C-alpha cells in the first residue's frame, strides 16, 4: 500500500502526541479525558505540531488529507486504546488547528486534500437532518452480520454474497440499531 506513507505519517502522528508535547506535559489528553461521555470523538490538534516535531512533514500530511484522514481517525482510536478502558466503539472526529496560513480565487481541481483557513458569514442555512450512515444486510440467504463501511455515497442495500454464491439483487433488512452512526447539518456561506 502506498498510503502506508501516511500511516507512517500516522506513526509520526502518534509519535509526538503521546510523547512530550508542550508545557512539560500533555496537550491532547484532557480532550481525550472529556470525550468519554457519549464517546464524543471530537479532538483538536495543532498543525504547528507537524512543524514542532514532524519537522515540516506537513507536505507529507497536507496533501493526502481526505485520502488518509481516515487513517488519522484510526490513529485517534489507536491512541485511545493504549490507556483508556476501551473497546473499539471509538469513532472519528479530528479538527486540526494552528496553521499560520490563510482565497476563493485560489481554488482549482488542484486544491483537494489540504487544510487551508477561510472565514465567512451566517446566511441561508439548513437544520439538523441526520444520516443513519452505517448498517447491516446481506443477499437473499444467510450471512446476517456486516459491521462494514456502508457510508460511501456509492452504497446500496442489496449485495451479492458473503460465504456462498447467492443472488445479486436480493436484500435483507438488518441491524440499523445496535451500531454507530453520525449527525450533520448544511448551509450556504458567502465570502468574507
Amino acid at each position: 500500500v502506498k498510503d502506508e506513507v501516511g500511516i507512517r505519517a500516522q506513526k509520526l502522528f502518534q509519535d509526538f502526541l503521546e510523547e512530550f508535547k508542550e508545557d512539560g506535559e500533555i496537550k491532547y489528553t484532557r480532550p481525550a479525558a472529556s470525550l468519554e461521555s457519549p464517546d464524543r470523538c471530537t479532538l483538536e490538534v495543532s498543525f504547528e505540531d507537524v512543524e514542532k516535531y514532524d519537522q515540516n512533514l506537513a507536505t507529507a500530511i497536507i496533501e493526502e488529507y481526505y485520502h488518509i484522514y481516515p487513517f488519522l481517525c484510526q490513529s485517534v482510536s489507536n491512541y485511545v486504546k493504549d490507556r483508556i478502558g476501551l473497546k473499539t466503539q471509538k469513532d472519528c472526529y479530528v479538527a486540526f488547528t494552528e496553521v499560520p496560513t490563510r482565497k476563493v480565487r485560489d481554488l482549482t481541481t488542484s486544491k483537494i486534500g489540504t487544510l487551508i483557513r477561510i472565514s465567512g458569514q451566517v446566511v441561508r442555512t439548513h437544520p439538523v437532518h441526520p444520516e443513519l450512515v452505517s448498517g447491516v444486510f446481506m443477499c437473499l440467504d444467510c450471512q446476517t452480520e456486516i459491521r462494514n463501511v456502508e457510508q460511501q455515497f456509492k452504497f446500496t442495500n442489496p449485495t451479492i454474497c458473503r460465504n456462498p454464491v447467492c443472488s445479486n439483487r436480493k436484500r435483507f433488512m438488518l441491524d440499523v440499531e445496535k451500531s454507530l452512526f453520525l449527525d450533520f447539518q448544511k448551509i450556504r456561506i458567502q465570502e468574507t
Binding site: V1, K2, R105, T109, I112, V123
Partner: protein, 606 residues
C-alpha cells in the same frame, strides 16, 4: 506517408516546416518584411531568453507570420488543428534546448490569432471543424465546473489498489482490475484522480454591421484550465476558437438521440512599459500648452465652446486619491463627476459617444427606456431550482468606466433619487430577503440634464430654473452651462469648417498635431512613480476664501457653497502638481476652480 486513414496530415512535415520557419525567423516582421521596423534573432529563441530569463511561463503567440512560408502548413493547420498544434508545441519544447538544454524542462506553454471572420449570423456545413474568431460584448459572470480524467481503485484482500487514467470515458473489466489474480471482483472509485476546470459565459455581438431590425444572436464556450477568469466580464472582446458540435439526448426516457446537433466553440484565447521615448514625456509636462493642446486633440473637428475643452482639462492626467494610509479612518475616496446640462440639442451625447466609442467600458443610457433598478440580474425564470440568484448587476459593471446617461430629468421620483449616495460613497447595501452584503463599485458620471423647460427662462437666476432646491440644484462645484450665442456670429463658423467634412476629402496635420498615438501613452505613465502631495502652500487660499465661498450664502434666490464641494476642490488639487513638475502643491491650481466656478457661480447678480 504515415497518416490517419481518413485524412492527409502528418506530424513530421508540419514540425520540420515550422522549425525551419522559426529558423527562417528574426522577427520576419521587424527583420525580414518590416525591415524598417526593428527590435535580430528568432523571436522564439529571443523569448526562450525573455521567457526563461523572465521565468514567466505560459507564452502567448500568433501564427499569422506563416503566410510567407509554405501555405500547405497554413491549410492543414486550419483544418486539422487539434492534431498539429501539439506538434508545434513539440517543436517549441525542442527549441528549449537550442538555448538552454539543461533547464528545468517541466513546464509547458499556452497558445493562431491570424484568420478572419465577418459575423456569426450565418454559417454552414463546411464550417464545422475550422478556425474562427469573432467578437462582441460579454453578458454574464459564471462559476466553475470541473471535469474528471481517471479512476483510482480499491481492493478487498492484499491491497490490489490499482489505478489508471481515461482515454475519455471507459475502464475495462475482466474479473479484477488490471486482472491481478482476481482475489476479488472488479473495483473502482472516482475521486483520487485527475480533474479539469471550465466555466461558461456567452457573448453578444455588437458591431456596426448588425443587420436591420435584428435581434441579438449570441454565442458561448467554456474555458480550459488556464483560461479561467482572465475576465473582468462584460466588454468589447474578440475570441479565437474552433467551431464545435455535439449530438443531443432525445427525449429522456432512454438512450434515444436527436437528429439536430447543438454547437459551440473550442476554448483558446482572448484579445484586448517602454523606457525608450522618455524625452517627450518631460517635454510635454514642461510645455505650458497642456491647458489646450491635448484638449485641442479630443474634439477632432469641433471647437464647440472650447472653454469646454478647457473643461476637458478637468479630466485626465490621472487623478490622485488622498487615500488614508496614516489613520485608516473614514474612507475619503477622491471621486469625480460632472454633467453637461440641457435646453439645446447640443453635443451631450456625441461627446459621450466619442468617449464610449473610445473607452472600452462603453454604455449609453437615458430615462424611460430602462429601469432604475437594472442592478438586479432578474430571476424571471432560471435554469435552476429557484435558488434565486441575482448574478450580476448591469449599470455597475463599469468598473472605473463610464455609463453615458442622457435626458436626465426624465424619470420618476424613485428613479434618479435612489442614487443619492453612491455618487460619493460607492456602496450598494443588498438588504433584501435574499443573500446579503455591502458591495463596492465606483466610477464616472456624465449626463444631459434638463429642466422642466426647453429654454432657460430669462429674468430668472438659475436656482429657480431646474426644479431642484438650492441644496440639490446648487450641489456640485459647477454643472456647466450650454447656451447659444445670441447672434449669427458664432453660428456660421463650424458650418463653414465642417459643412465640407463630406467635401473636404482630406485632413490638415497642423501645429496642433493630430497625435496618432504619441498622446495615448504618456497618460498611461501619468500615475506611476511620482505621487502628488499637499503641504502648506496651496490650501490656505480657500481656507481663507471660504469667507468668499460661503458669505454669499446670506441670500435666497442666490446661492453659496456647501461642504462637499470643498472636498471636490481638494480633489482638484491632485492633478496639476506632477505635470509642470512639483508633486508638492502649487497655488495656482485653485484659480482653475475660480476659472471654473465663478464662470457660473458669481453669475449671481439678481
Amino acid at each position: 506517408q504515415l497518416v490517419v486513414w481518413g485524412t492527409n496530415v502528418v506530424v513530421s512535415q508540419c514540425k520540420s516546416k515550422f522549425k525551419s520557419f522559426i529558423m527562417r525567423f528574426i522577427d520576419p516582421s521587424a527583420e525580414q518584411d518590416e525591415i524598417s521596423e526593428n527590435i535580430n534573432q528568432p523571436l522564439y529563441l529571443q523569448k526562450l531568453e525573455e521567457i526563461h530569463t523572465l521565468e514567466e511561463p505560459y507564452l502567448n503567440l500568433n501564427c499569422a507570420h506563416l503566410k510567407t512560408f509554405d501555405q500547405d502548413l497554413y491549410r492543414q493547420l486550419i483544418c486539422y488543428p487539434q492534431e498539429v498544434i501539439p506538434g508545434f508545441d513539440m517543436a517549441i519544447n525542442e527549441m528549449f534546448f537550442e538555448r538552454y538544454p539543461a533547464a528545468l524542462l517541466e513546464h509547458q506553454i499556452q497558445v493562431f490569432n491570424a484568420d478572419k471572420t465577418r459575423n456569426m449570423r450565418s454559417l454552414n456545413p463546411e464550417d464545422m471543424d475550422q478556425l474562427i474568431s469573432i467578437s462582441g460584448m460579454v453578458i454574464r459572470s459564471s462559476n466553475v465546473i470541473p471535469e474528471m480524467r481517471e479512476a483510482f481503485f480499491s481492493c478487498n484482500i492484499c491491497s490490489f489498489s490499482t489505478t489508471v487514467e481515461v482515454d475519455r470515458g471507459r475502464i475495462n473489466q475482466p474479473t479484477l482490475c488490471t486482472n491481478c489474480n482476481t482475489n476479488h471482483c472488479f473495483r473502482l472509485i472516482h475521486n483520487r484522480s485527475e480533474f479539469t476546470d471550465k466555466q461558461l459565459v456567452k457573448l453578444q455581438e455588437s458591431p456596426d454591421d448588425m443587420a436591420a431590425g435584428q435581434t441579438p444572436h449570441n454565442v458561448l464556450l467554456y474555458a480550459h484550465n488556464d483560461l479561467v477568469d482572465k475576465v473582468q466580464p462584460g466588454d468589447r472582446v474578440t475570441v479565437t476558437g474552433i467551431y464545435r458540435a455535439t449530438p443531443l439526448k432525445t427525449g429522456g426516457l432512454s438512450s434515444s438521440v436527436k437528429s439536430v446537433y447543438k454547437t459551440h466553440v473550442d476554448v483558446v484565447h482572448f484579445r484586448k512599459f517602454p523606457p525608450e521615448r522618455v524625452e517627450l514625456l518631460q517635454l510635454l509636462a514642461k510645455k505650458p500648452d497642456i491647458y489646450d493642446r491635448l484638449a485641442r486633440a479630443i474634439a477632432p473637428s469641433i471647437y464647440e465652446n472650447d472653454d469646454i475643452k478647457k473643461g476637458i482639462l478637468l479630466q485626465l492626467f490621472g487623478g490622485t486619491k488622498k487615500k488614508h494610509a496614516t489613520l485608516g479612518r473614514q474612507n475619503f475616496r477622491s471621486e469625480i463627476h460632472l454633467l453637461l446640462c440641457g435646453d439645446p440639442g447640443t453635443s451631450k451625447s456625441q461627446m459621450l459617444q466619442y468617449v464610449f466609442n473610445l473607452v472600452p467600458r462603453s454604455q449609453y443610457t437615458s430615462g424611460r427606456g430602462s429601469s432604475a433598478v437594472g442592478l438586479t440580474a432578474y430571476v424571471t425564470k432560471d435554469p435552476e431550482t429557484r435558488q434565486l440568484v441575482l448574478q450580476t448587476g448591469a449599470l455597475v459593471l463599469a468598473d472605473n468606466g463610464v455609463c453615458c446617461i442622457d435626458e436626465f430629468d426624465k424619470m420618476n421620483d424613485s428613479t434618479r433619487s435612489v442614487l443619492h449616495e453612491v455618487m460619493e460613497q460607492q456602496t450598494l447595501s443588498i438588504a433584501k430577503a435574499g443573500i446579503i452584503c455591502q458591495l463596492n463599485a465606483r466610477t464616472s458620471i456624465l449626463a444631459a440634464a434638463n429642466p422642466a423647460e426647453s429654454q432657460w427662462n430669462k429674468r430668472k437666476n438659475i436656482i429657480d430654473n431646474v426644479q431642484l432646491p438650492h441644496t440639490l440644484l446648487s450641489r456640485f462645484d459647477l454643472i456647466f452651462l450650454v447656451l447659444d450665442p445670441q447672434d449669427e456670429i458664432f453660428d456660421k463658423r463650424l458650418a463653414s469648417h465642417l459643412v465640407s467634412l463630406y467635401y473636404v476629402t482630406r485632413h490638415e496635420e497642423e501645429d496642433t498635431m493630430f497625435d496618432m498615438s504619441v498622446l495615448r501613452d504618456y497618460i498611461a505613465y501619468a500615475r506611476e512613480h511620482l505621487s502628488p502631495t499637499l503641504s502648506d502652500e496651496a490650501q490656505q487660499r480657500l481656507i481663507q476664501a471660504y469667507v468668499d465661498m460661503r458669505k454669499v450664502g446670506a441670500g435666497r434666490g442666490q446661492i453659496s457653497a456647501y461642504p462637499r464641494q470643498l472636498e471636490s476642490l481638494i480633489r482638484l488639487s491632485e492633478a496639476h502638481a506632477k505635470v509642470r513638475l512639483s508633486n508638492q502643491v502649487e497655488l495656482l491650481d485653485v484659480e482653475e476652480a475660480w476659472r471654473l466656478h465663478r464662470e457660473a457661480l458669481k453669475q449671481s447678480a439678481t
